[PDB]
Structure formats: C-alpha cells, structure tokens
C-alpha cells in the first residue's frame with residue numbers, strides 16, 4: 432500500500448479489509464479495557480475514526496482488526512464526488528497526512544442499504560460490546576445545512592448506536608461556521624428533535640464532532656449549547672487547518688486537514704478543555720494522533736472515555752491496534768488504575 436498513491440492505497444486497504452483477508456487479531460481484550468458509555472458496552476476503548484470507511488464497506492473487517500467500535504462516514508444525503516485528485520498527501524517525516532477529500536460520499540441511500548444488509552448482525556455485535564457509529568455530513572451545494580443533517584438522522588439514525596453531527600471538516604466551505612453558538616443551537620435542536628422521533632430501539636445517541644482550531648469563545652459556546660440541549664457526547668477532534676511549526680514533509684503546505692502526530696497534543700488539550708467546560712458530565716471520544724498506549728491514556732486521563740485513530744494505521748499497519756490496546760493495559764496497571772473507567776479524567780482530579 433505504501434508504494435501506490437495514497438488514495439489508491441486507501442481504496443485497496445478498504446477492499447482488502449472488507450473481504451476479511453486479514454487474519455483475525457490475536458489480542459484478547461481484558462476486562463480492564465471495557466467501558467460503559469453512551470448507553471452501550473464497549474469491549475475496548477479503541478475505535479476506527481471516521482474517514483477510513485466513509486461508505487460503510489468494511490465494518491465487519493474493522494471489528495476483526497480488533498477495534499472496539501467502528502465509525503463510518505461522513506455520509507452526505509445525496510451522492511457526491513468530492514474534490515479533484517490528488518486530494519490526499521503523506522508527510523512521512525512528520526508521521527502525518529493532509530487530506531482535502533471534500534466529503535466524497537456514496538450518499539444516504541446506498542449506505543442505508545449496505546447497513547440494512549447486516550442490521551441484525553450489527554445488533555448482535557452491539558450487544559456483545561462492539562457498537563457502531565455513523566458520522567453525518569452535508570452536501571456541498573445544499574442550501575439548508577440543518578435539513579441535510581436531519582435527513583441523515585432519519586435515514587441512518589435507526590441503524591446506528593450513535594450519530595455524529597460533523598460540523599468540523601476543514602474541506603467544505605462554511606461548514607465550521609456551524610460551530611458558532613446561534614447556528615449550532617438551532618442545528619442541534621432540529622437534529623435532536625428528529626432523533627427523539629425515532630422508535631426507542633432505533634434511537635441513537637447524538638454527538639458533535641469539533642475542530643482543534645476553535646477559539647476559547649467557540650469552545651465556551653459549544654459547551655454551553657451541549658449542556659443546554661442535552662447533547663450526548665463530543666468527538667474531539669477533527670483534523671487541523673493549522674500547520675504547527677516544525678513540519679518537515681515536502682507537502683506540508685498543501686491545503687487540507689492535517690492529521691497524525693503533529694495534531695496529537697492539540698487534540699489532547701482540546702479534550703482537556705472540553706471536559707472541564709462540561710464538568711466531566713459529557714462523554715468525549717478523543718481522537719487525533721493516537722499511535723500508542725501512552726497516546727491513548729493521555730487522552731483518557733485528559734477526559735476521553737473512548738479514543739479513535741486513523742492516520743497511525745496507515746504508517747504502522749493493522750498491528751497498531753493490538754499494540755495500542757496492550758500498551759494501554761500495561762500503563763493502566765503501572766499507574767494503579769483498576770481499568771479504563773478509573774482513568775477517565777484522572778488528570779483533573781490531581
């Protein structure tokens with residue numbers, strides 16, 4: 432996969448994963464790694480971040496890889512092609528990636544039928560501690576962003592353990608302004624009303640996924656709206672449009688969202704701030720630059736109940752999943768935690 436262009440390599444990775452051609456992971460999850468949050472049991476706290484399986488093609492292969500939960504998407508209401516290629520760039524010297532896909536999506540109807548073909552299989556997986564998240568986006572030309580998200584709630588909500596209102600892609604014009612207070616309250620009120628209108632066994636948790644580039648005011652406002660409306664959780668963070676000092680990759684000045692190691696601590700600090708602003712009462716899924724057990728535990732101690740990764744998988748391969756989990760269990764023991772749950776937010780209680 433490293434030898435092809437990055438997008439072609441990704442498509443080959445998705446196809447290979449979907450076929451199950453990867454040997455089943457050998458790491459057996461210990462009880463120490465179980466987390467109960469968002470109304471569900473998670474066998475382990477390490478998920479695949481949105482973007483790897485944009486269209487829901489490889490869910491079962493990803494569980495076989497050892498992920499404790501899978502998030503697909505972002506999915507847009509209508510199919511759309513995204514930006515012209517190339518739109519994904521490797522920064523090997525930084526263990527980073529820059530992408531500007533622009534919400535390439537098979538669309539709600541195609542993804543709906545894909546998930547329906549395995550809906551009862553997923554119900555059993557969820558009951559066994561392996562939940563499914565669905566990340567919702569908006570079409571490029573849509574005139575009414577809230578209605579795009581409402582359509583996603585109605586169509587894929589009934590197939591999801593949790594939904595993500597992705598208002599933080601750097602690659603759709605105007606999207607991140609949906610993170611402002613008034614716009615976000617109106618958008619999330621509509622999303623939650625649509626969610627509440629689904630039948631009980633088809634009613635997912637709703638989370639908001641936020642950028643790492645927010646001002647202090649932006650974060651205060653998001654925290655306020657999340658508590659006012661009863662939003663079920665936050666995903667922290669998407670990719671960054673910043674370019675931290677010190678990037679070495681030749682492609683560092685490509686337009687797009689930066690992921691991987693240069694994002695890691697910006698993400699951890701955003702988790703830390705959002706946990707404090709919500710008094711530790713709002714579950715956080717922490718994501719950005721996780722490639723080791725230490726990376727995972729730092730985000731958990733900062734306030735994350737669960738973590739996700741994507742970019743590290745494309746540098747270290749499938750073994751990184753078991754590596755993170757084994758290192759995490761060892762660090763929890765070394766630091767005197769009974770399990771993941773005991774470590775959530777621990778830095779704030781020092």
Ligand SMILES: Cc1cc2nc3c(=O)[nH]c(=O)nc-3n(C[C@H](O)[C@H](O)[C@H](O)COP(=O)(O)O)c2cc1C
Pocket residue numbers: 480481482483485504505519528530532534566597640668669670690691692694718719720721739740741742743
């Ligand atoms: C190529 C690529 C595509 C992505 N697509 C999406 C997406 O469609 N929706 C979304 O919410 N996040 C998307 N992300 C963001 C990731 O879910 C994650 O938030 C971010 O990459 C940081 O995690 P990482 O450093 O482990 O990759 C994408 C990231 C990458 C690298």
Ligand SMILES: CCc1oc(=O)c(Cc2c(O)c(CC=C(C)C)c(O)c(C(C)=O)c2O)c(O)c1C
Pocket residue numbers: 432433434437438440441442444445447448453519520521528530744745746747748749
């Ligand atoms: C869009 C971001 C992006 O997404 C990808 O999916 C890949 C492919 C890829 C990979 O998925 C895995 C993980 C292997 C699986 C079978 C799932 C890899 O181990 C590698 C390598 C070199 O080891 C790999 O290149 C990318 O290169 C990039 C830049």
Ligand SMILES: O=C(O)c1cc(=O)[nH]c(=O)[nH]1
Pocket residue numbers: 482505530531532533534535597599600601602669670688
């Ligand atoms: O371009 C996309 O589709 C995309 C990239 C990214 O980093 N984040 C996101 O939410 N969408």
